[PDB]
Design a protein around this ligand. Structure first.
Ligand SMILES: Cn1c(=O)n(CCCO)c(=O)c2c1nc(Oc1cccc(OC(F)(F)F)c1)n2Cc1ccc(Cl)cc1
Ligand SMILES: Cn1c(=O)n(CCCO)c(=O)c2c1nc(Oc1cccc(OC(F)(F)F)c1)n2Cc1ccc(Cl)cc1
Ligand SMILES: [Ca+2]
Ligand SMILES: [Zn+2]
Lengths: 666, 104
C-alpha cells in the first residue's frame, strides 16, 4: 500500500459522553452543572465519580490543576477516589493541599512521599505544613555504607534503589527543609555538600545531579551569608565552635562560595590588616616603600618576640601582614644567598663558610617548618596541596645534597661521573630551581597575578591529561625509530656520541637517545642529517625521514594546536568564575598566617555557661538570618518569573467560573 | 533507622484561627468582611495587626497585592504601620504612597 494506516494500538480507557461532559464542566470550573452531575451520580447513573481520563486526568486531579478551592471542596465532600492527588497539589505549589491533609499507573515514583516532593518543589509554606502534620523522611545510607539488606535491595532492583537514594538526597539538599528542620543549617549545608561530592565521586552515573545538588547547597550557604547585616552577626557566625572555627570548617569543606563572600572578605581583610588603616588608601609607591622598609628591617622585629614578646616591636609580629612581609623578606634573603652561592678544585669540598654555611640551618628551619605542617593536617592535607609536595621534594634534594657532601668529606677532569661532589652539585642546582620557583606561589596575595596563578594551577591537570597522550605517541615513534635505526650504531672515530654535539650523530641508535631526540625535535633543535646513515641504504634513510616527518606533523601541527584549543576551552571554563577561586586561595594563605603557631620565620624558629551563651547567641542570630532569607526568596520568587501556560489557564478559568456563577445568579 | 524531622525553628505562633481567617480575607479582597473583622477588633477578641507565617503585616498584604480599598479601611480604623511606607515605595505604586503620606 502507498498509505500508512493509523490506529491506536494502546487504546487505554474510554469515557462515556456524560463522563466527558462532567470532566469538561469540571475543567470550566462550574458550580451548578458539576454539583448536579454528582447529585445524579449519587443515584444509579452512568456518571461515575472516579472518572479517569486516558491522559490520567481524574476530576480530582483536574480540580487540583484547576486550583478552585470551592470545586476541590465539593469533590472531597462526596468522597472521590483520593489517590496521588495530594502529590499533585504538592507539585502545583498551591496552599490548598491542607484541605486534602484535613480530609493504575502513578505519575510519580512509588518512593515519593509528600515531604520529598515538597522539598523538591522548594515551597516554604508547603514544607512547613507537612512538618507540622508530623513527618519523618527515610534515612539515606552512608556514602560508603555496608548494609546486607541494602545490598540485597540493590540486587533486587538496582534502579529503584538508586532513584530512591537520589530522591532522598534531593529532598535533604533542599534549602527550605535545611532552614526548617536542621539545628545548624551551615554545618548541615557543609556536611551535605561534602556527602554529595563524595556521592558523585562514588556514583559515576548520576554525577551531574549530585553536582547540581552540591552547588545548590553551596549557593544556599552563600545566600545565608548574604542575609547578614552586621559585623557582630559575622563575628557570631564565623567564630562559632561546638578563633574562626566555622571559617576553618568552610576552608576544609571547600566552600568557595561561602569563603569568597564580600562580608566574609571584609572581616578577613579587617583581621589581616590588624590595626593598619589606610593601607589601600595610601599611594602605591608609598605602600611599597612601607613594605620594603618593614621587610628590610626584618631581623629587628624577628629578634623581638623571641626575647621580649610583650614589647611593641615584639607585638609588631602579631599583625599577620607584618608576619607575611617578614616571611617573604626571609625567602628573598634565602634566594639572595642562593644567588651568591651560585656566584676549590678539591676532591671533597670544605664547607664554604663565606656564603654556603648559613644556608645549612635555614634549610634546617625549612625542614622544621615542613615537619610542623606535617603535624598540622596529617598526610592527606599535606598531599592535598601541590606546593607542599614541591616543598617536600625541595627539602629531600637539600637533605640529599648535605648527605652527599658529608659522604664526600668522610671519603676536575679525573673523577668518576658518580662522584658525590658532582651529584651533590647537580642536586643542589635542581633544589635551587625548585626554591626559586617557590616564589610564584606568593602571587595569590597580589591582586593582579592571583587569578593568573590559580587558573594555571587548575589547568595543569588538563595539561597533564594531554601529555599522557603525547607520551604514548612519543613512545610509539621512538620504538619505530629504534627498530629501524639500530643496525647503524657508529662505534669508531666519534669524538662525541649523541645529539648533544656540534655534529649530531647516533640520534636513533638506542631507545634513550631516541626519546631525547624525539623530545628535542619539538623545538627544532634536531637537524635533518641525523637520519642519514653512513651506508648507501637510501630506502631506510627515506623511511626514517618520513617517520621523523610524520612524528613532527603529529606533534607540532596536530597535537600542539589541539592543546591550544583544549587550553582555550579550559581557560574559558576557569575564568568564567576564577575570582572566587582566587579569593578562596588568598583566604587560605591569610588564615594559614593567622595562626599563633609559626609566628617566627624559619630563621629563628629553629565553661558550660559560656557554651550555652554562645549557642543561644548563634541560635537567635540565625533565626534572624533564616527569617531574612525566606523573606528574600519569597520576594525574589514573586518577580522575574514567567507566567507560562498554567497561569493563563488559571486566570482564564477564574473568569469562566465567575461568568458561570453570574449566569447562575442572574 | 529513620531520621526524625521536626520544626526546630518554629518562631511563628498559631495564636487563634481568627487571625488566619482575617489574613485570608486580606488576600481575597473582601472589603465588608474585613470591615466586620475590624468591628470585632473594636470588640476585642482578635487584634488588628498579626504577623503571618511569612513575616509580613496586614498593610503589607494591602500594598504588595496592590489594592487600595482595604488599605484605606485599616487606615480609617487605625493600624500599625511597622515600616510600611518603605513597602509602599517598594511596590512602585503612587496612590498608596500618597495615602501613606496623607525587611529593609
Ligand atoms: C624534560 N625532558 C628533557 O629534558 N629531556 C632531555 C633529556 C636529555 O636530552 C627529554 O629527553 C625529555 C624530557 N621530557 C620528556 O618526556 C616528556 C613527556 C611528556 C611531555 C613532555 O613535554 C613535551 F610534550 F615534549 F613538551 C616531555 N623527555 C623525553 C623522554 C626522555 C627520557 C625518558 Cl626515560 C622518557 C621521555
Ligand atoms: C610526512 N611527510 C614527510 O615525512 N615528508 C618527508 C619525506 C622525506 O623527506 C614529506 O616530504 C611530506 C610528508 N607529508 C607531506 O605532504 C603533506 C600533505 C598534507 C599535510 C602535510 O602535513 C603538514 F601540513 F605539512 F604538516 C604534509 N610531505 C610533502 C610531500 C613530499 C613528497 C610527495 Cl611525493 C608528496 C608530498
Ligand atoms: Ca607550606
Ligand atoms: Zn547500605
Amino acid at each position: 500500500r502507498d498509505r500508512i494506516p493509523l490506529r491506536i494500538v494502546r487504546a487505554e480507557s474510554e469515557l462515556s459522553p456524560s463522563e466527558k461532559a462532567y470532566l469538561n464542566a469540571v475543567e470550566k470550573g462550574d458550580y451548578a452543572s458539576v454539583k448536579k452531575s454528582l447529585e445524579e451520580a449519587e443515584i444509579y447513573f452512568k456518571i461515575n465519580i472516579n472518572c479517569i481520563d486516558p491522559l490520567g486526568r481524574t476530576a480530582l486531579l483536574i480540580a487540583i490543576e484547576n486550583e478552585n478551592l470551592e470545586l476541590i471542596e465539593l469533590l472531597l465532600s462526596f468522597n472521590v477516589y483520593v489517590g496521588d492527588a495530594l502529590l499533585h497539589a504538592i507539585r502545583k505549589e498551591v496552599v490548598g493541599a491542607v484541605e486534602l491533609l484535613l480530609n493504575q499507573f502513578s505519575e510519580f515514583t512509588p518512593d515519593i512521599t509528600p515531604i520529598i516532593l515538597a522539598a523538591h518543589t522548594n515551597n516554604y509554606e508547603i514544607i512547613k505544613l507537612l512538618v507540622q502534620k508530623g513527618v519523618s523522611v527515610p534515612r539515606p545510607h552512608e556514602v560508603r555504607c555496608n548494609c546486607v539488606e541494602c545490598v540485597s535491595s540493590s540486587d533486587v532492583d538496582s534502579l529503584r534503589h538508586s532513584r530512591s537514594r537520589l530522591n532522598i538526597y534531593k529532598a535533604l539538599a533542599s534549602p527550605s527543609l535545611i532552614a526548617l528542620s536542621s539545628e545548624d543549617p551551615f554545618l548541615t549545608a557543609f556536611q551535605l555538600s561534602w556527602e554529595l561530592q563524595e556521592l558523585s565521586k562514588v556514583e559515576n552515573e548520576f554525577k551531574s545531579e549530585y553536582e547540581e545538588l552540591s552547588r545548590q547547597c553551596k549557593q544556599f550557604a552563600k545566600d545565608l551569608l548574604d542575609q547578614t547585616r552586621s559585623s557582630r552577626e559575622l563575628e557570631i557566625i564565623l567564630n562559632y565552635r561546638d578563633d574562626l572555627a566555622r571559617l576553618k570548617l568552610a576552608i576544609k569543606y571547600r566552600q568557595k562560595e561561602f569563603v569568597a563572600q564580600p562580608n566574609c572578605q571584609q572581616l578577613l581583610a579587617s583581621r589581616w590588616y590588624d590595626e593598619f588603616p589606610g593601607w589601600r588608601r595610601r599611594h602605591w609607591a608609598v605602600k611599597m616603600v612601607t613594605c620594603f622598609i618593614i621587610g628590610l628591617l626584618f631581623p629587628v622585629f624577628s629578634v623581638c618576640y623571641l626575647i621580649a614578646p610583650k614589647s611593641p616591636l615584639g607585638l609588631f609580629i602579631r599583625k599577620p601582614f607584618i608576619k607575611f612581609i617578614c616571611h617573604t623578606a626571609s625567602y628573598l634573603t634565602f634566594l639572595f644567598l642562593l644567588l651568591l652561592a651560585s656566584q676549590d678544585l678539591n676532591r671533597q669540598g670544605p664547607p664554604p663558610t663565606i656564603v654556603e654555611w648559613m644556608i645549612l640551618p635555614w634549610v634546617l628551619g625549612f625542614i622544621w617548618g615542613e615537619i610542623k605542617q606535617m603535624w598540622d593536617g596529617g598526610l592527606q592535607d599535606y598531599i592535598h596541596d601541590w606546593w607542599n609536595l614541591m616543598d617536600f621534594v625541595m627539602n629531600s634534594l637539600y637533605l640529599a645534597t648535605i648527605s652527599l657532601k658529608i659522604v664526600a668529606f668522610v671519603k676536575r677532569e679525573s673523577w668518576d661521573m658518580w662522584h658525590p661532589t658532582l651529584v651533590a652539585e647537580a642536586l643542589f642546582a635542581i633544589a635551587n630551581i625548585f626554591s626559586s620557583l617557590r616564589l610564584i606561589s606568593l602571587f595569590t596575595a597580589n591582586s593582579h597575578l592571583g587569578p593568573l596563578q590559580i587558573s594555571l594551577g587548575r589547568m595543569l591537570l588538563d595539561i597533564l591529561k594531554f601529555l599522557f597522550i603525547y607520551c604514548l605517541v612519543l613512545l610509539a615513534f621512538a620504538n619505530g625509530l629504534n627498530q629501524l635505526y639500530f643496525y647503524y650504531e657508529e662505534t669508531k672515530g666519534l669524538t662525541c656520541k649523541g645529539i648533544r654535539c656540534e655534529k649530531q650523530n647516533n640520534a636513533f641508535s638506542t631507545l634513550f637517545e631516541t626519546l631525547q631526540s624525539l623530545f628535542w625535535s619539538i623545538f627544532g633543535l634536531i637537524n635533518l642529517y641525523v637520519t642519514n646513515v653512513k651506508a648507501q641504504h637510501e630506502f631506510t634513510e627515506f623511511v626514517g625521514a618520513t617517520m621523523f616527518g610524520t612524528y613532527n606533523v603529529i606533534s607540532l601541527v596536530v597535537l600542539l594546536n589541539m592543546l591550544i584549543a583544549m587550553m582555550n576551552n579550559s581557560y574559558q571554563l576557569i575564568a568564567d568564575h576564577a575570582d572566587i577561586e582566587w579569593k578562596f586561595a588568598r583566604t587560605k594563605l591569610w588564615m594559614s598566617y593567622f595562626e599563633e603557631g609559626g609566628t617566627l620565620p624559619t630563621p629563628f624558629n629553629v565553661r558550660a555557661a559560656d557554651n550555652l551563651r554562645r549557642h543561644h547567641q548563634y541560635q537567635e542570630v540565625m533565626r534572624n538570618l533564616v527569617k531574612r532569607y525566606v523573606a528574600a526568596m519569597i520576594r525574589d520568587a514573586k518577580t522575574e518569573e514567567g507566567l507560562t501556560e498554567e497561569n493563563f489557564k488559571e486566570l482564564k478559568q477564574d473568569i469562566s467560573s465567575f461568568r458561570f456563577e453570574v449566569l447562575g445568579l442572574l | 533507622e529513620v531520621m526524625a524531622l521536626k520544626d526546630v525553628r518554629e518562631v511563628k505562633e498559631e495564636n487563634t484561627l481568627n487571625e488566619k481567617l482575617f489574613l485570608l480575607a486580606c488576600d481575597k479582597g473582601d472589603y465588608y468582611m474585613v470591615k466586620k473583622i475590624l468591628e470585632e477588633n473594636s470588640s476585642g477578641d482578635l487584634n488588628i495587626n498579626c504577623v503571618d507565617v511569612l513575616g509580613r503585616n496586614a498593610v503589607t498584604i494591602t500594598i504588595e497585592n496592590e489594592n487600595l480599598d482595604i488599605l484605606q479601611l485599616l487606615l480609617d480604623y487605625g493600624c500599625q504601620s511597622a515600616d510600611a511606607l518603605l513597602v509602599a515605595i517598594d511596590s512602585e505604586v503612587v496612590g498608596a504612597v500618597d495615602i501613606l503620606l496623607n525587611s529593609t
